[PDB]
Design a protein around this ligand. Structure first.
Ligand code: SAH
Ligand code: SAH
Ligand code: SYT
Ligand code: SYT
Lengths: 341, 341
């Protein structure tokens, strides 16, 4: 028997080899599958609906401020922090980001001239993609991160894009009468404490002609909070704080149609996400020395730097096991297209 | 190689034994499972959404008049023609009908004093159940069958029920400003050519306080029209005419929330339906001589009587194979509770 702190100690000291690390995390996700799958569809739906109902009761009641230079050394060219799309075995992370952006544009039915809102826009890859491809679109990113807003505005300037603005806001607190032809939510809904109210708020920012496109990490069958099942799981709470991230089932959002109506529904197989986190892990490993140097003035000590790096690297190692599980057929990416009620 | 007419000939002459009959029908449903299941959830959703979209394009464009005495000889006490619920191995069809009625009342949140509409009420078992149990409810059955209306009214009279009325109407053509606290649709939606318009129509018969409860035969994973895949399937078109019956997936109705909003969702394992059709088959077999005598004056010849009997018996034999497939975990019954938008 070994404690959390024992495994955590070895992890932070780089004493767990990649083989053992992957094995340990795969086992943790294996136990999540045992927890989530029920013997009958009757029981599966009972379990799933209990989860959905609990989310609706949450109506009653991560640090994205890392330096841009570090994020540039770990992620692809546009610093996309979401599942990318890989056509080939030799597809690069840069190509995969672009392919994913194109996929979103196709599925969200983006057309030149539209007003576009990207909720939780991150480093703005999708915002910049749409702004460059569709010069008559006006594209607004919304983020709660000052660093992210500043990065996007700088990039828009460098790219001679005049059709970009960024709203600095907590989306759950943002009040506006403004409406948009297209609202995009790419791997942001997983952070939403109150989904029913979130979807309601989004619907008020839509007209009859608007479409809403949501992309979220999912499991194909069941939903779960990204948290430890038992005391043996050192991994989940290390990656995300308690209550930060919800992994909805691929169909969970179908039960959140009070204010929006589904038009289409897709999933993207988990191997795409697996290849995404693998590319990030490999790039971080290649740029390890550089990353360490970038992080040192902002953090204080080499130990605090090692801590941030281990966190991100383990996220990628763990993510690989999660999304590659059964060749991408467990955890994957769900996508949904909605119109307003 | 053997033709449809060859198998059909032997079936109508009672030359196919129960063992071979079950085996043949099981194989037909086996091929439906091969048709419906896709290798990845990505492909599964593509397939499922194509089906859902095709149903929404059907916005552009069985004989329930058999004698009551015959139906009494084949079905349970209230002549329920839908999946029943069996607690025990020794549960009778009469007990299973009552248990199913109770299940609907619980899940549809029936309370004394409500106005209740039962759409496609059949021989009115559920209508009579609610009327007797809840004396302050006013219960309306709606059916397109004169025989069914007449049977219900007679039963209500015999049972001293003063809170029952029956609307004789094609539900798709029925126009009314009347609203109801509860609308129940028990294995009727499978007959609906236009589901989106059906759900829309139902919503106009609801107020803000109303609930809609739908029960339908389903497959847990995919939808299909109840029809022959290939030329080898003699069974499907014999049971139902082309375009009569749609088997929605257990989740298909989640995509039909334009005008109603989901509140709860259940499935009942297929063994309950299997036990239902088994009980009907066994009762028909026990009352075979009587059934033949009942049907003779209304039909004309012993051959025409044998035809109706073979149709109903094969429905039960086939239904057993369909619903018992993988211990009830393929085809089953889906149930959904909705409020108005
Ligand atoms: N309450 C909130 N309000 C606004 N933004 C939020 C938020 N909670 C999380 N976010 C943002 O949502 C993002 C999720 S990461 C996804 C980023 C981007 N859509 C991409 O695909 O790369 C983070 O960048 C975070 O800043
Ligand atoms: N367009 C339509 N309008 C009204 N009733 C219809 C209809 N199409 C089918 N039906 C009725 O719907 C019923 C389906 S059978 C289910 C009967 C009953 N709900 C029970 O559980 O036993 C049939 O009795 C048929 O008469
Ligand atoms: C957007 N997401 C929000 C929720 C979430 C949750 C996840 C996940 C990825 C995501 C995504 C993608 C992503 C990629 C890189 C990141 C990251 C996230 C968080 O946070 C820091 O670095 O893999 C397992 O569980
Ligand atoms: C109501 N349903 C409508 C659609 C449908 C479709 C079915 C099924 C049962 C039914 C039900 C249940 C039933 C039971 C007995 C019947 C019957 C039906 C038809 O028609 C004549 O006798 O089993 C396989 O496919």
């Amino acid at each position: 028997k070994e404690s959390i702190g024992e495994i955590m100690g070895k992890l932070m000291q780089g004493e767990i080899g990649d083989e053992e690390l992957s094995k340990r995390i795969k086992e943790i996700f294996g136990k999540r599958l045992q927890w989530g799958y029920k013997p009958t569809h009757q029981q599966q739906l009972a379990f799933n609906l209990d989860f959905i109902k609990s989310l609706k009761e949450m109506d009653m009641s991560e640090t994205y401020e890392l330096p841009s230079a570090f994020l540039e050394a770990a992620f692809g060219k546009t610093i996309k922090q979401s599942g990318c799309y890989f056509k080939d075995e030799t597809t690069t992370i840069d190509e995969a980001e672009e392919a994913s952006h194109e996929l979103y544009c196709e599925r969200a039915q983006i057309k030149d001239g539209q007003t576009v809102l990207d909720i939780g826009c991150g480093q703005g890859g999708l915002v910049l993609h749409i702004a460059q491809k569709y010069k008559n679109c006006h594209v607004t990113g919304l983020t709660n991160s000052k660093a992210q807003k500043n990065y996007i505005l700088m990039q828009a300037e460098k790219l001679q894009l005049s059709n970009v603005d960024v709203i600095l806001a907590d989306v759950t607190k943002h009040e506006s009468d403004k409406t948009y032809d297209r609202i995009l939510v790419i791997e942001t809904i997983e952070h939403m404490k109150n989904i029913q109210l979130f979807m309601k708020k989004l619907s008020t920012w839509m007209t009859e002609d608007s479409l809403l496109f949501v992309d979220h990490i999912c499991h194909k069958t069941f939903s779960h909070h990204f948290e430890a099942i038992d005391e043996d799981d050192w991994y989940s709470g290390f990656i995300f704080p308690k209550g930060c991230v919800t992994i909805l089932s691929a169909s969970a959002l179908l039960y959140f149609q009070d204010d929006v109506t589904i038009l289409d529904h897709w999933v993207v197989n988990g191997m795409h996400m697996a290849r995404s986190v693998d590319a990030w892990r490999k790039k971080l490993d290649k740029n390890m020395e550089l990353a360490r140097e970038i992080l040192l003035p902002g953090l204080g000590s080499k130990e605090a730097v090692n801590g941030v790096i281990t966190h991100i690297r383990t996220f990628c190692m763990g993510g690989y096991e999660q999304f590659s599980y059964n060749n991408g057929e467990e955890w994957m990416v769900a996508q949904m297209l909605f119109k307003k009620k």
